[PDB]
Design a protein around this ligand. Structure first.
Ligand SMILES: NC(=O)c1ccc[n+]([C@@H]2O[C@H](COP(=O)([O-])OP(=O)(O)OC[C@H]3O[C@@H](n4cnc5c(N)ncnc54)[C@H](O)[C@@H]3O)[C@@H](O)[C@H]2O)c1
Ligand SMILES: NC(=O)c1ccc[n+]([C@@H]2O[C@H](COP(=O)([O-])OP(=O)(O)OC[C@H]3O[C@@H](n4cnc5c(N)ncnc54)[C@H](O)[C@@H]3O)[C@@H](O)[C@H]2O)c1
Ligand SMILES: [Ca+2]
Lengths: 334, 331
């Protein structure tokens, strides 16, 4: 059977990397049809919203693949990524970090999964100018979201045969909010003794992660911590050009995207790395139970990387993004 | 001769301060430490101990301190002493090899607002708000400090780290006050980076950074990330400033409570910022001497604590420096 995935190409470098992965999908003869709509437009109706056509495509198809959306610095419209995740209750962000065999970095055999609460934390859209020159941004942690992401991560650890979950938090500094996040992970930890559990302050994790990534497995944090730690560990294995992600909700609703943003400094050119959005479309295929297409698409990009010859700029190469994609497609088909 | 306020602090704090005192004695350093005990003191007696430290500082102007713990004691201390600016010098130690050798970075963190003021409440059952404060006043001071640091120390780039795309009002204010004062220093290159990106940059290629300025929470993240790059805590020093006071700490502050009563803690970080202290007291001979004795003992690699791949105890490592130091003064 053939299934339809909503495609949001996104801003900056997103249109070129989507084209890439689409093109690699046709090469691999995947049972995928793309329905293209643009969440890039942000519309003011007080409320901010996703254009009607994107909302219906997702509600019809309930699989998404998406390039980065630009969010203005200190000025314009709110994150339409935040908006996407909240309007579809994509409460779990899944950011595995795994060493790429044929690409050498100073760290070896990194196998990290950052699991980040996607809906609340310091990434609520809530700030208030108290008086002139005094701003208060509001972080929000709730029982129900904290319990739910903790259940997700213990459950993820079983699905992928991971053995430890680490609650990452700052409950010393923020006693009420992180306290509630951590107390709720302790509870789900006590209901799943088949999984070894521990907790670590966020600074300590980053102080250790860069020294010995060997010590970590699955990570759970509220929103703002997971955002930062997942970029931290992208540094370990090759950078923001290889690191996939997926926004998971209930009932098999999900939008897959790479961890990286828009890359405005390499946008017009053909320098992008698509393996990030590729590897997340690989997550997307496995989510859909299309395992044997996922296996080949993956195997090809890795083989393409373990060779050398055609690696993109960010991985020590001279190759255009187009040139890079063609070698993946060449390797699929055979 | 010189009176210095001393707060040993938590965990290995006291065992670290002890190594400083021993190294100073061997170097015959003309400093007399006035010890004060602030960590986990009863809550009713807190503000009085807080005040005599305030007044001890009024006499001594300089201090060296361990890690501490309606706001937290740390915040109260920082506030009573107005220690708005924190600086942590991330620098590779020549014999101590990591994945990021030859690294020279400075991290300037403001440490009197943001997520650290303890402003939380329950707005419904299960629903908890936490308020992070950004003010023009404080963000102005810390950006001027960063740029004065860059000017004073002959640095050339100052990079402001923010999350102003999604926290547009809070981090926006911090970011544009840095933009404002970045024009008052046209001889210094100003850049800006979103914080997650920058932590990716810090791991993959930290050599493009020079000097960094950020609010409190991001400073905690990056203080510890960068310390990790050059060999961790145990090795990286920091100091914090007011308009009058200079207080010297370790760079990535942690109590290391698991190490108390073992003989395993690394006094390298505390000894180094002790030498940074002695420079601030115009004891450049004593500071230069203690510092590159510590660096030489580490470089030769005969005696090293367990976090630096050796097997030596804290005391053995401290005595190794004192022997080196006490010999330098002879030769
Ligand atoms: N929707 C999302 O998932 C997402 C994520 C992050 C940032 N953003 C948004 O996009 C903009 C990004 O700002 P930023 O500079 O922090 O984004 P960024 O993640 O692109 O960081 C900038 C740099 O990271 C490197 N890089 C990232 N992706 C790369 C790739 N595929 N190939 C090669 N190099 C790559 C390059 O140095 C790039 O220039 C912001 O407006 C921000 O709001 C969106
Ligand atoms: N005692 C309890 O019952 C309890 C309960 C909950 C939390 N805690 C607190 O959690 C803390 C542990 O968490 P943390 O994140 O602050 O870790 P931490 O205090 O152990 O420091 C983090 C790491 O940094 C290194 N380090 C720090 N100082 C060093 C030195 N002088 N020499 C060599 N290495 C050094 C060590 O590798 C250390 O493990 C405890 O120390 C404790 O105060 C304690
Ligand atoms: Ca990110």
């Amino acid at each position: 059977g053939v299934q339809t995935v909503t495609l949001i190409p996104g801003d900056g470098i997103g249109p070129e990397i989507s084209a890439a992965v689409m093109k690699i999908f046709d090469a691999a003869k995947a049972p995928i049809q793309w329905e293209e709509r643009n969440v890039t437009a942000i519309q003011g109706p007080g409320k901010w919203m996703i254009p009607s056509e994107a909302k219906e495509s997702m509600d019809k198809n309930k699989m998404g693949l998406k390039g980065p959306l630009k969010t203005p610095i200190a000025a314009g419209h709110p994150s339409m990524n935040l908006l996407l995740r909240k309007t579809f209750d994509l409460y779990a962000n899944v950011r595995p970090c795994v060493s790429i065999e044929g690409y050498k970095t100073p760290y070896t055999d990194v196998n990290i999964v950052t699991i980040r609460e996607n809906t609340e934390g310091e990434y609520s859209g809530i700030e208030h100018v108290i008086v002139d020159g005094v701003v208060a941004s509001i972080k929000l942690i709730t029982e129900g979201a904290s319990k739910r992401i903790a259940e997700f991560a213990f459950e993820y650890a079983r699905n992928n045969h991971r053995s430890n979950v680490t609650a990452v938090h700052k409950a010393n500094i923020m006693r009420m909010s992180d306290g509630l996040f951590l107390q709720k992970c302790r509870e789900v930890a006590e209901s799943c003794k088949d999984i070894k559990f521990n907790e670590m302050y966020l600074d300590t994790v980053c102080l250790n992660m860069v020294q010995d990534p060997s010590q970590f497995d699955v990570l759970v944090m509220p929103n703002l911590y997971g955002d930062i730690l997942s970029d931290l560990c992208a540094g370990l294995i090759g950078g923001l050009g290889v690191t996939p992600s997926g926004n998971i909700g209930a009932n098999g609703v999900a939008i897959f995207e790479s961890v990286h943003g828009t890359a405005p400094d390499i946008a017009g050119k053909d320098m992008a790395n698509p393996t990030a959005l590729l590897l997340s479309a690989v997550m997307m295929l496995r989510h859909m139970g299309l395992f044997d297409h996922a296996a080949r698409i993956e195997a090809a990009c890795f083989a393409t990387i373990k060779d050398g010859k055609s690696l993109t700029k960010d991985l020590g190469g001279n190759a255009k993004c187009s040139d890079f994609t063609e070698e993946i497609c060449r390797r699929v088909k055979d | 001769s010189f009176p210095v306020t001393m707060l040993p602090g938590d965990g290995v704090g006291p065992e670290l301060m002890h190594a400083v005192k021993e190294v100073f004695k061997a170097a015959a350093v003309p400093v007399e430490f006035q010890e004060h005990h602030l960590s986990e003191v009863q809550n009713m007696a807190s503000e009085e101990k807080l005040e005599q430290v305030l007044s001890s500082m009024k006499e001594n102007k300089v201090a060296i301190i361990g890690k501490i713990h309606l706001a937290s004691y740390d915040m109260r201390l920082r506030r009573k002493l107005d220690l708005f600016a924190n600086v942590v010098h991330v620098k590779s130690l020549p014999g101590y090899m990591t994945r990021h050798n030859n690294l020279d970075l400075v991290i300037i963190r403001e440490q009197t607002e943001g997520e650290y003021s303890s402003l939380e409440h329950e707005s419904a059952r299960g629903v908890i708000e936490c308020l992070k404060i950004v003010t023009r006043a404080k963000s102005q001071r810390i950006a001027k400090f960063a740029f004065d640091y860059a000017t004073k120390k002959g640095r050339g780039k100052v990079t402001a780290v923010h999350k102003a795309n999604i926290m547009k009002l809070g981090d926006g204010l911090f970011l544009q006050c840095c933009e404002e004062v970045a024009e008052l220093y046209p001889k210094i290159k100003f850049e800006t980076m979103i914080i997650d990106n920058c932590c990716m940059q810090l791991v993959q290629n930290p050599y493009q950074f020079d000097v960094l300025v950020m609010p409190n929470l991001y400073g905690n993240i990056i203080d510890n990330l960068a310390a990790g790059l050059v060999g961790g805590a145990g090795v990286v020093p920091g100091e914090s400033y007011s308009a009058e006071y200079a207080v010297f700490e370790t760079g990535a502050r942690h109590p290391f409570a698991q190490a108390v009563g073992r003989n395993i803690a690394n006094p390298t970080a505390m000894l180094l910022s002790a030498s940074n202290m002695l420079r601030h007291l115009n004891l450049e001979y004593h500071s230069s001497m203690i510092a590159d004795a510590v660096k030489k003992v580490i470089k030769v690699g005969k005696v090293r604590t367990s976090d630096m791949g050796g097997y030596a105890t804290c005391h053995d490592f401290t005595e190794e420096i004192c022997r080196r130091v006490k010999d330098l003064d002879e030769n």
